[PDB]
Structure 1
Amino acid sequence: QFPRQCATVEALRSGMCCPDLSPVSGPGTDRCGSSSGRGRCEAVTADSRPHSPQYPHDGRDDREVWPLRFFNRTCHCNGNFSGHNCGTCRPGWRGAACDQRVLIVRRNLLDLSKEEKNHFVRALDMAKRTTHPLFVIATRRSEEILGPDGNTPQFENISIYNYFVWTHYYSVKKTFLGVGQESFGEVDFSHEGPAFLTWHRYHLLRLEKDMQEMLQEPSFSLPYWNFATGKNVCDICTDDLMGSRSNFDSTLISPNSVFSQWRVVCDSLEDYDTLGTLCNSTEDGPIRRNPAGNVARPMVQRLPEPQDVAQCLEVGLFDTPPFYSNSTNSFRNTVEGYSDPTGKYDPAVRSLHNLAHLFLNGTGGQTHLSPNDPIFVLLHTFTDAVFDEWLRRYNADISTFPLENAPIGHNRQYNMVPFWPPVTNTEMFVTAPDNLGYTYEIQWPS
């Protein structure tokens, strides 16, 4: 979403989001850090190609051709510089000249020290309460973005971790069609399509970076939860990490965990889809969680089996046509969890990443809310580990990642919605140790 200095009337009407870095000579004199050689304000590249025929409402939705409905000029940064005003570095690089390499290690949460476990939990909690220093979220679609009087931008501050929740919601929300009409839901800019793995990889990377700056700890890293244990229970749902079941309500989190204090955003879908508004920063009820609780649906009462991870890493093509939740022999669709681990599509099957979401039988299993439960972070870093191992094992073969005819939002060169600055799926389709500055300490079965 947008740098708080781009969420003004001036910026939105010019279509330019090219903020200053250190504007010595006055405003506008250091856009994109051009005085320092770090970047320059220039035209946005956005994907032109056709998408699948499943979305019929070209022209109606602000997530189309992202971000051209809001800005047509951004900062491009030179070299290994990066960020909304080119004032930081590309993933894997540090220093004022962005010329020092770093490599941080993402580890299994159960293998951390008592002190490292406590530091992680207290850091999530701080992110939940700490206002994001750069990004503000929009509460109205673009037509009403400047407010009733036309001069009041409809943006709100939000916490670091609620930003993480918001962007996932924005990429899954329905297309508003107008009051009186049913909003359109056959669209998902981050699920059911080739962009699944790369969307969520940038999602994690932006959170890791935000927390590093919040803690001032360059080497802070996000752990993972190995959920492919076949267990009846959530082995990380304990009060020293992530929270156990409350004894007073079997669908709430233990009061001995900070996460029982969290309150969720984006849970008023009735309003958003009828009034045409967006999720805002006001929090509501608590997290609901009930591991193995879905008696009505016995298939989602046990976690994926260790063999399932072995099997899906044998699927060799990243994706297959029609590039959707009914793709067969698609590694994206297998690890996302709409195929079985072998790649066999069946409308009833729920494996791997999907299964892990449904196992929680609660807030974590509802697509518009699931990042509110912080197990989301650990569930997706493990999914990203599987992604990374595939990228290594098949030499990052991006050839099956379609350039066109994918569901809207999922073409290879689509800017992932709504990340800022614009970033394409191609930019995340690399092995993480050599290119993004992080690696997984992990061993795979066979």
Structure 2
Amino acid sequence: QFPRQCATVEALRSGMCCPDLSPVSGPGTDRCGSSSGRGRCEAVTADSRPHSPQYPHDGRDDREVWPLRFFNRTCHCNGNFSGHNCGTCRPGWRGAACDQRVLIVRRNLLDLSKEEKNHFVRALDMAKRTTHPLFVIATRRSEEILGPDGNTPQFENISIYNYFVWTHYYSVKKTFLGVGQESFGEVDFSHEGPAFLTWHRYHLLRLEKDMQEMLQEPSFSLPYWNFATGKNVCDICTDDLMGSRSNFDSTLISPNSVFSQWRVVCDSLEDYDTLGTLCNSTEDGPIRRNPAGNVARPMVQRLPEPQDVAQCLEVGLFDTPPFYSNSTNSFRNTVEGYSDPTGKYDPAVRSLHNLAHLFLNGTGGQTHLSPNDPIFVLLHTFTDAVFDEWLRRYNADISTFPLENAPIGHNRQYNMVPFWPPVTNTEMFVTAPDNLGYTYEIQWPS
């Protein structure tokens, strides 16, 4: 979503989100940091190629051809500068001139020290409470974007972690057709499609950078959760980590974990699809979690098994047609978890990433809401680690990633929704240690 600078009336009608960085001579003088060498305001590149027929309603949704329904001018930064301003560096780079290489290691959460574990938890909690310095979030769609009196832009501040929750939600939201109409649900800009891995890759990358600056610890790194242990229990659901089960309510978090204080955003789906609003920054109920607790669906009461991971890393093609949740022999669908680990589709199966989510039987198992459970972060860094080792192993072969006729949002050169500045699936489809400034301290079953 957009920087405060662009959540204006002036920017929203220029269609230009190109804020100043060091406005030496006054407003408009140093857009994208062109006083220094750092970048320029420029036309926006966005994918025009067609998408799967599954989504009929082109013309209705503001996530189509993202981000062109809100802005047609963006900053493009030079070299290894990056950021809405070109005010910072590309991932893996720091310094005033973005020429000092940095490499951070995402470790297994259970291998961290007592003080590392505790630093992580309170960082999360701090990110849940601290206002995001950059981004605000839209409470209404583009029609009512400038509010009732056409001169009050409908954006709210929001905490760092809730932004993480909100962007995921905005990408899964249903298409509003009109009051009295039934909203459209066969659309997911981040799941059931080849953008699933790269969307969630950047998602994590933006939370990590935000926490790096909130803590001002450039080396801060997001640990991972090896959820592929075949276990009957959540081995990170302890009070020093992500919170044990409440003894007063089997679906709540132990009051001795700070996460029992957290209150969720984006739970009022009935309001969003009825009135046409969007998730705002007003928190509601608490997190709901009950590992293994879904007695109604026994498939989901046990986590994936270590081989499940070893089998999916042998699926050689990244994705296969129709590039959807029912593709066979697609690595992206296998580790997403709509096929079994060998690649074989079945509408009943749930493996790997999906089954980790379902196992929680709670807030973490509902797509519009699962980031509210901070196990999400650990759940997707591990999903990303598997992605990263597939990229190492098959030499980042993006040939199977379709350029056309993926479900809308999942074409290879689609700008991933709603990240800003616009960033494509291709930009994330690279091995992370050499290109994105991070690596995984991890070993793989064989």
TM range (shorter): over 0.9
Deviation sequence 1:389-445 (CA, Å, 0-9, x none): 000000000000000000000000000000000000000000000000000000000
Shift of 1:339: 0.4
Deviation sequence 1:245-299 (CA, Å, 0-9, x none): 0000000000000000000000000000010000000000000000000000000
What is the match of residue 29 of structure 1?
Answer: 29
Report the TM-score when normalising by structure 1.
1.00
Shift of 1:321: 0.3
**Is 1:363 equivalent to 2:366 in the alignment?**
no
Deviation sequence 1:137-178 (CA, Å, 0-9, x none): 000000000000000000000000000000000000000000
Distance in 2, matches of 1:111 and 1:133, equals 32
Give secondary structure in 2 for the equivalent of 1:34.
coil
Gaps of 5+ in 2: none
Shift of 1:209: 0.1
Deviation sequence 1:189-238 (CA, Å, 0-9, x none): 00000000000000000000000000000000000000000000000000
- Give the number of equivalent residue pairs: 446
Identity, % of aligned positions? 100
Give secondary structure in 2 for the equivalent of 1:143.
coil
Deviation sequence 1:85-142 (CA, Å, 0-9, x none): 1000000000000001000000000000000000000000000000000000000000
Give secondary structure in 2 for the equivalent of 1:74.
strand
Give secondary structure in 1 for the equivalent of 2:143.
helix
Distance in 1, matches of 2:29 and 2:277, equals 36
Give secondary structure in 2 for the equivalent of 1:33.
coil
Distance in 2, matches of 1:63 and 1:5, equals 21
Distance in 1, matches of 2:85 and 2:114, equals 39
Deviation sequence 1:293-341 (CA, Å, 0-9, x none): 0000000000000000000000000000000000000000000000000
Distance in 1, matches of 2:19 and 2:440, equals 35
Deviation sequence 1:349-400 (CA, Å, 0-9, x none): 0000000000000000000000000000000000000000000000000000
Distance in 2, matches of 1:307 and 1:21, equals 50
Distance in 1, matches of 2:372 and 2:15, equals 32
Shift of 1:51: 0.2
Mapping for residues 415-430 of structure 1, pairs under 5 Å? 415-430=415-430
Give secondary structure in 2 for the equivalent of 1:91.
coil
What is the match of residue 298 of structure 1?
Answer: 298
Distance in 2, matches of 1:46 and 1:307, equals 39
Distance in 2, matches of 1:325 and 1:134, equals 34
What is the match of residue 113 of structure 1?
Answer: 113
Deviation sequence 1:30-63 (CA, Å, 0-9, x none): 0000000100001000001000000000000000
Give secondary structure in 1 for the equivalent of 2:412.
coil
Distance in 2, matches of 1:48 and 1:249, equals 50
Distance in 1, matches of 2:107 and 2:37, equals 37
Shift of 1:24: 1.0
Give secondary structure in 2 for the equivalent of 1:76.
strand
What is the match of residue 63 of structure 1?
Answer: 63
Distance in 2, matches of 1:235 and 1:32, equals 46
Distance in 1, matches of 2:219 and 2:257, equals 26
Superposed CA RMSD in Å reads 0.3
Mapping for residues 10-409 of structure 1, pairs under 5 Å? 10-409=10-409
Distance in 1, matches of 2:25 and 2:63, equals 36
Give secondary structure in 1 for the equivalent of 2:399.
helix
Distance in 1, matches of 2:291 and 2:320, equals 33
Give secondary structure in 1 for the equivalent of 2:136.
strand
Distance in 2, matches of 1:168 and 1:75, equals 23
User: Following TM superposition, where does structure 1 have runs of at least 4 consecutive aligned residues deviating by more than 4 angstroms?
Assistant: none
Distance in 1, matches of 2:194 and 2:288, equals 30
Give secondary structure in 2 for the equivalent of 1:105.
strand
Give secondary structure in 2 for the equivalent of 1:358.
helix
Distance in 2, matches of 1:326 and 1:366, equals 19
Shift of 1:20: 0.0
Shift of 1:82: 0.2
Distance in 2, matches of 1:396 and 1:67, equals 27
Give secondary structure in 2 for the equivalent of 1:421.
coil
Distance in 1, matches of 2:42 and 2:229, equals 49
Distance in 2, matches of 1:116 and 1:177, equals 48
Gaps of 5+ in 1: none
Give secondary structure in 1 for the equivalent of 2:177.
coil
What is the match of residue 438 of structure 1?
Answer: 438
Distance in 2, matches of 1:43 and 1:391, equals 31
Give secondary structure in 2 for the equivalent of 1:400.
coil
Give secondary structure in 2 for the equivalent of 1:439.
strand
Distance in 2, matches of 1:286 and 1:170, equals 20
Distance in 2, matches of 1:399 and 1:210, equals 32
